């Protein structure tokens, strides 16, 4: 499915050894479906795939 109308926000984050950062993203897509997620900067990692 496609994706559009992408907005990002961080209510709070806490640099730590754990997944202390939480980010809420508003998205709009064409249809129901799976989609991969990644961070292209090595300085940050995402638990979810």
């Amino acid at each position: 499915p496609s994706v559009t109308d992408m907005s990002c926000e961080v209510p709070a984050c806490t640099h730590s050894s754990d997944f202390g950062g939480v980010a809420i993203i508003k998205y709009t897509a064409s249809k129901k479906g799976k989609c991969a997620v990644h961070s292209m900067t090595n300085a940050v990692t995402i638990r979810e795939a």
Binding site: P11, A12, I24
Partner: protein, 49 residues
């Protein structure tokens, strides 16, 4: 016969005085420091709100 005014009237800041035991109560002077250790259970993650 000549006792005079009791301390419950002559006490600055009007600290009410009792007996058995003798205490001075309800006088406003200075301030109080309070330290509260609050378990995280009451705390709610921002996303929840």
């Amino acid at each position: 016969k000549e006792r005079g005014a009791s301390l419950q009237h002559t006490a600055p800041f009007g600290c009410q005085i009792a007996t058995n035991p003798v205490r001075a109560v309800n006088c406003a002077v200075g301030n109080i420091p309070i330290s509260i250790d609050i378990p995280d259970a009451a705390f709610t993650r921002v996303v929840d709100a």
